[PDB]
Amino acid sequence: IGWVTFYFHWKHLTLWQGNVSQFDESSTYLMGWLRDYLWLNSSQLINGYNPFGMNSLSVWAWIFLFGHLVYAT
């Protein structure tokens, strides 16, 4: 399911941003899936709360880390 829900999200994020070539090329190799998808999109979520302030995405950043904690436990 992880692979299927990651394919949906990228195929569609590239559809919605207008950069369909992004998926049509980066998806071919796995490195594109990590840097162009997981790493690039995670840029905002992780910045929900930084030493300079916090925005409405703070709960998701807190949960994102919370998920890692429960997963590791």
Positions in the binding site for ligand CLA (CB under 6 A): 69, 72-73
19 touches other proteins (CB under 8 A) = no
Q: Name the token pair of 22.
A: 């992004």
Identity of the residue, 4 or 69, whose beta carbon is nearer to ligand CLA in the bound complex: 69
- Indicate which single residue of 17, 37, 51, 67 sits in contact with other proteins (rule: CB under 8 A): 51
Distance CA 32, CA 61 (A): 23
Helices (H) and strands (E) in the chain, counts: 5, 2
17: contact with other proteins by CB under 8 A: no
